[PDB]
Amino acid sequence: AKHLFTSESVSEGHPDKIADQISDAVLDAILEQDPKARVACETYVKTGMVLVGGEITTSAWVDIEEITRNTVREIGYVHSDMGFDANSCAVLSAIGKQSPDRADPLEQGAGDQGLMFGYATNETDVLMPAPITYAHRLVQRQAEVRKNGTLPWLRPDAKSQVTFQYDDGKIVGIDAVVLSTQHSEEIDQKSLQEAVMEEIIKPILPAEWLTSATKFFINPTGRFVIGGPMGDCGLTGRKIIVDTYGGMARHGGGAFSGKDPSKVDRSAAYAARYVAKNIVAAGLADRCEIQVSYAIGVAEPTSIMVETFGTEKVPSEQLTLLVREFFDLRPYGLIQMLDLLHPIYKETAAYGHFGREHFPWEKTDKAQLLRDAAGLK
Amino acid sequence: AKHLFTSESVSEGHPDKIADQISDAVLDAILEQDPKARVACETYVKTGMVLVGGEITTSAWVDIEEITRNTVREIGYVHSDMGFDANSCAVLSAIGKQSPDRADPLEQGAGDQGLMFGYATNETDVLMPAPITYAHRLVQRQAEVRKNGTLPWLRPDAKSQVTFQYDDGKIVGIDAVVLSTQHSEEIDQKSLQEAVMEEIIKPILPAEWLTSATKFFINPTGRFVIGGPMGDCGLTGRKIIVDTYGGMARHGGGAFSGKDPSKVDRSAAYAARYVAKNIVAAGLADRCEIQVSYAIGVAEPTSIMVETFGTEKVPSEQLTLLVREFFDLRPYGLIQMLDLLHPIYKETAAYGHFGREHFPWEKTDKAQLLRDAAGLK
Ligand SMILES: Nc1ncnc2c1ncn2[C@@H]1O[C@H](COP(=O)(O)OP(=O)(O)O)[C@@H](O)[C@H]1O
Ligand SMILES: Nc1ncnc2c1ncn2[C@@H]1O[C@H](COP(=O)(O)OP(=O)(O)O)[C@@H](O)[C@H]1O
Ligand SMILES: [K+]
Ligand SMILES: [K+]
Ligand SMILES: [K+]
Ligand SMILES: [Mg+2]
Ligand SMILES: [Mg+2]
Ligand SMILES: [Mg+2]
Ligand SMILES: [Mg+2]
Numbered sequence: 001a002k003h004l005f006t007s008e009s010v011s012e013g014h015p016d017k018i019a020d021q022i023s024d025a026v027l028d029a030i031l032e033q034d035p036k037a038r039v040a041c042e043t044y045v046k047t048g049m050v051l052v053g054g055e056i057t058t059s060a061w062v063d064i065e066e067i068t069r070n071t072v073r074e075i076g077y078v079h080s081d082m083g084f085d086a087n088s089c090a091v092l093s094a095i096g097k098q099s100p101d102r103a104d105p106l107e108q109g110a111g112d113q114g115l116m117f118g119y120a121t122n123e124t125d126v127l128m129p130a131p132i133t134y135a136h137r138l139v140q141r142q143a144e145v146r147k148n149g150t151l152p153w154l155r156p157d158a159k160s161q162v163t164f165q166y167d168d169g170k171i172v173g174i175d176a177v178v179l180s181t182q183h184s185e186e187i188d189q190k191s192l193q194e195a196v197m198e199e200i201i202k203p204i205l206p207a208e209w210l211t212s213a214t215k216f217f218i219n220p221t222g223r224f225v226i227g228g229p230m231g232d233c234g235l236t237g238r239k240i241i242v243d244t245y246g247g248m249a250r251h252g253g254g255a256f257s258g259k260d261p262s263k264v265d266r267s268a269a270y271a272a273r274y275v276a277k278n279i280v281a282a283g284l285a286d287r288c289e290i291q292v293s294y295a296i297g298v299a300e301p302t303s304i305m306v307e308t309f310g311t312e313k314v315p316s317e318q319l320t321l322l323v324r325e326f327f328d329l330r331p332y333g334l335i336q337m338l339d340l341l342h343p344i345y346k347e348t349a350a351y352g353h354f355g356r357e358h359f360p361w362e363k364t365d366k367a368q369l370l371r372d373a374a375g376l377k
Numbered sequence: 378a379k380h381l382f383t384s385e386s387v388s389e390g391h392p393d394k395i396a397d398q399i400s401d402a403v404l405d406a407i408l409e410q411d412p413k414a415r416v417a418c419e420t421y422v423k424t425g426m427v428l429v430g431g432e433i434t435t436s437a438w439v440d441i442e443e444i445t446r447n448t449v450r451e452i453g454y455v456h457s458d459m460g461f462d463a464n465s466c467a468v469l470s471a472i473g474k475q476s477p478d479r480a481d482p483l484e485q486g487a488g489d490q491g492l493m494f495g496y497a498t499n500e501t502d503v504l505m506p507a508p509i510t511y512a513h514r515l516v517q518r519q520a521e522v523r524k525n526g527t528l529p530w531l532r533p534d535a536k537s538q539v540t541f542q543y544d545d546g547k548i549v550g551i552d553a554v555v556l557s558t559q560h561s562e563e564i565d566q567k568s569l570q571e572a573v574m575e576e577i578i579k580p581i582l583p584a585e586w587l588t589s590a591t592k593f594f595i596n597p598t599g600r601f602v603i604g605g606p607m608g609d610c611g612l613t614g615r616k617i618i619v620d621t622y623g624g625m626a627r628h629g630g631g632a633f634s635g636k637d638p639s640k641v642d643r644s645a646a647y648a649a650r651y652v653a654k655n656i657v658a659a660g661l662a663d664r665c666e667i668q669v670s671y672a673i674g675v676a677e678p679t680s681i682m683v684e685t686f687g688t689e690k691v692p693s694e695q696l697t698l699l700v701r702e703f704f705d706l707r708p709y710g711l712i713q714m715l716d717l718l719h720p721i722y723k724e725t726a727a728y729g730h731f732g733r734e735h736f737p738w739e740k741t742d743k744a745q746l747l748r749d750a751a752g753l754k
Contacts, residue, residue, distance in 0.1 A: 001693060003682050003684075003693075004680040004681075004682055005668060005680070005682055006492045006668065006670035006679065006680050007492065008490055008491060008492060008629070008630070040609075040610065042421070042610045042612055044419070044421050044428065044430065044612070046430050046471055047473070049471070051421065051428065053421065053423050053610055054610070055608060055609070055610065094423055094426070096424070096608065109598075113385055113536055113538050113555055113557070114385060114538075115383045115384065115385060115538075115623075115624055117624065159490055161490050161491075161492075161670070161672065161679075163670065163679055163680050175679075175680070176672065176679050176680075178490055178672040178673070178679075180490070180673065215679075217672050217673075217674075217675065220672060220673050220674040220675065221486075221673055221674040231432060231473065232417075232432070233417065233419045233430055233431070233432065235419055235421070235612050235613070235614065236612070237612065237614075237615050238614050238630065238632065239630055240617060240628075240630060241628060241629055241630040242630060246492075247492055247494065247627050247628060247629050247668070248627075249627075250624050250625075250626075250627055250628075251617075251618060251624060251627075251628055252385070252618055252624050253385070253615065253616055253617060253618040253619060255615065291382060291383065291624070293383035293538070293540065295538065295553065295555040295594050295597060296555070296557065296594075296597050296598055297594075297597040297598040298594065298597065302383065302538075302540055302552075302553050302555075302592075303381040303382070303383050303540050303552070303553075304381075305380050305381055305382055307380075316378060316380075
């Protein structure tokens with residue numbers, strides 16, 4: 001049935017994502033010195049200031065003010081005219097530090113309750129949904145041409161959104177595409193939209209998908225000149241959907257950034273992506289969404305649910321059998337299954353946690369073994 | 378097919394929700410003096426402090442420090458031993474104020490891009506999903522018996538989670554229920570769990586749903602004595618799922634609290650709940666989820682999608698016909714359709730935005746007219 005679906009993405013330097021990137025940059029910094037560190041680092045940004053606020057239990061010593069300024073500088077906010085300068089903004093920390101003091105470590109219970117969901121679909125190369133994939137790819141391309149000299153009047157803040165017409169389950173094409181970019185006072189609006197259309201949109205959206213009818217809204221109100229934290233406000237854990245799957249699949253509440261791996265909110269979600277992506281790569285289903293939940297102090301998950309939406313190649317009884325076998329979903333088990341105690345997290349914080357094959361949760365190593373046990377074919 | 382699903386909720390006084398309630402309390406206060414005010418008030422709480430941070434364009438004058446302290450006092454954090462005192466904590470504001478300066482007001486375009494989803498299901502009295510409904514009802518009952526003298530050793534912070542076994546689409550019963558409550562040093566753990574079980578859980582969970590097998594985890598690690606902001610950290614827009622539908626249905630990124638009605642993130646989502654709830658009350662479907670999206674500076678929605686999951690009583694072509702007719706979904710139209718410019722928002726910020734019939738988006742006034750035009754029956 002023809003039906004349209006939308007997903008947005010934002011760039012590095014959109015204020016919410018700045019806050020994510022700072023949080024995960026502090027996480028990485030601590031993890032580099034102490035991979036067993038427990039962190040929950042929440043960050044807030046507003047026109048003058050970055051507040052980095054936290055509970056951290058670690059041996060490590062790390063410089064919050066330095067880490068912050070460097071993250072704001074790579075994003076590019078380095079002069080008042082943009083909205084925000086990494087070298088003169090205020091950095092404020094309010095992190096509580098604690099230093100450290102079951103027979104099988106794997107049987108350690110979950111710290112905090114909750115629900116996590118994970119998804120895969122055979123509709124892109126990366127086994128991710130088409131909308132959120134291209135949506136991210138628009139903003140990423142913007143950052144690229146910004147940062148490579150090509151289109152250097154572009155400034156950091158940018159939002160993208162793409163709407164896709166599907167008829168059933170086939171992506172038929174792109175109905176509308178919207179893109180808004182901060183830019184210097186230097187460039188005119190009409191020349192801006194020539195360049196966005198040539199350099200950003202045309203190299204990313206598949207041409208077969210683009211029609212005579214495709215409604216493109218480039219800088220629709222726009223003269224987007226100041227942006228980033230200037231006059232807006234970013235907090236970690238607000239681009240929760242963008243981070244995930246653009247609203248194709250579901251979500252339990254939870255944020256990833258600034259949480260070390262002991263946090264099921266993060267690591268359970270990462271593991272869920274991995275179990276689903278492996279299922280689809282083995283051809284056990286076309287589209288798979290999984291809910292796993294935990295209760296505080298219990299180590300086995302309180303629930304698993306697989307929704308293969310009528311797209312199975314083996315009945316869900318057998319499917320849920322293999323899920324709960326090939327994958328250790330005890331909190332410390334999934335930390336092991338995916339080898340998470342490593343500074344790999346700042347890269348996660350812009351452009352989507354999933355869909356980028358070089359992440360431990362994006363590997364399809366278990367594809368065949370799943371294929372086998374699920375009645376080989 | 379038997380399959381389990383989970384949803385969590387938290388109380389007023391869980392730190393994220395404190396921050397929500399403060400944001401919406403400032404919204405209400407401004408709206409009482411100036412209903413056309415534009416606000417985006419983001420709040421952060423950590424052990425000593427509340428940072429209320431914002432952009433506000435209004436004539437009104439309102440006292441942030443007073444509003445804050447009063448909200449923290451009704452929640453109950455009024456002494457250091459709890460974790461946090463409303464009368465001695467630090468309140469810090471960083472709100473930018475601006476005072477004010479198409480032929481049809483209704484045709485005014487959307488301010489910001491985005492996607493919103495809304496849901497209804499005939500599975501509860503309130504046309505909301507069973508899990509998130511009971512989950513909320515657990516925490517609400519906790520707050521009630523806390524606040525009515527009955528169980529007065531209870532302190533503010535509490536989390537609940539209920540997992541439901543469904544066989545297909547029938548809620549069969551409650552597999553597990555978990556509940557964790559802050560409490561005074563005064564009460565013992567075992568007597569605590571007698572009382573939680575008698576007074577909170579037993580009057581809320583339907584007994585027919587409770588089995589010999591129902592795994593109840595009351596205070597599982599627990600001696601939860603300090604809580605609220607003490608040693609944790611709350612930010613508005615983190616209980617995004619709880620707010621909604623406990624992960625039964627989808628979400629675009631977006632937070633509600635501290636956003637005045639011009640924000641589609643909020644009002645479009647509210648309107649979507651209303652269009653779906655009306656569809657289901659008219660018996661046009663059993664379960665209905667709707668995605669509506671907007672692009673900045675356009676007034677008609679860029680997409681509408683209805684997923685009636687094989688539960689229609691009329692084909693989705695006709696359904697999407699009636700949706701886009703009976704409901705004005707232009708930003709100013711939905712503000713009108715639901716009469717939103719009123720201080721009604723602090724009540725929204727704990728216990729769920731939906732499912733509570735006395736909200737303008739919970740009315741089923743359009744039920745019959747939808748029934749009619751969708752081929753009367
Ligand atoms: N001292 C600490 N060190 C590291 N992480 C912590 C510490 N205190 C809090 N956290 C954890 O980090 C997580 C981030 O908070 P959050 O997910 O917001 O809780 P909730 O999901 O209930 O809102 C918490 O679940 C909490 O267990
Ligand atoms: N001065 C202002 N007055 C009121 N609301 C504002 C003002 N500045 C920002 N806001 C609005 O409040 C909304 C809340 O921010 P947010 O939803 O986080 O943007 P995004 O969805 O891109 O993250 C913004 O979409 C923005 O349009
Ligand atoms: K969020
Ligand atoms: K965090
Ligand atoms: K807000
Ligand atoms: Mg935001
Ligand atoms: Mg969480
Ligand atoms: Mg939180
Ligand atoms: Mg938004």
